[PDB]
Amino acid sequence: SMDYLVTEEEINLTRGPSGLGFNIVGGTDQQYVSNDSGIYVSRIKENGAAALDGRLQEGDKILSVNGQDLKNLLHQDAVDLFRNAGYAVSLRVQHRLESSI
Numbered sequence: 001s002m003d004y005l006v007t008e009e010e011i012n013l014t015r016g017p018s019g020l021g022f023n024i025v026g027g028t029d030q031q032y033v034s035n036d037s038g039i040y041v042s043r044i045k046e047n048g049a050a051a052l053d054g055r056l057q058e059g060d061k062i063l064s065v066n067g068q069d070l071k072n073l074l075h076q077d078a079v080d081l082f083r084n085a086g087y088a089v090s091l092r093v094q095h096r097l098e099s100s101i
Contacts, residue, residue, distance in 0.1 A: 004041010005098055011055045011091045020082065020089065022056060027075030033100040039070045039078045041093075061094040099100070 013020055026032045041060040050056040062070050065081040066089060073081075073083040082089070 005096065007095045008094055009040060009055060009095060010092055011031060011053065013049045013053055013089045013091065015049055015087050015089060018048050020050055021045035022050045024062065025076065028069050028072050029079055030075040037072055056093065057095055059099055061096060062091060064092040066090050
């Protein structure tokens with residue numbers, strides 16, 4: 001298999017006044033491309049925690065947040081896992097060379 005197309009990374013962010021500062025897409029009810037229910041990072045905002053930390057990449061697939069898996073969740077349920085979090089947020093992500101068309 002083409003394993004070199006993906007890696008994974010644990011990313012830990014500290015939430016300050018500027019917020020985490022990224023946007024997500026996806027979910028079982030909002031598939032980013034046909035037949036893919038994954039949650040992906042669409043945009044990283046300048047001056048948010050994610051941009052300052054530098055590890056998060058646009059196109060990353062988010063696999064878990066604070067140990068809660070983001071496999072086959074509704075879009076809002078995924079969003080809630082982030083927005084209900086506190087000051088410390090742990091993410092497991094898949095960095096992807098591919099983008100889906």
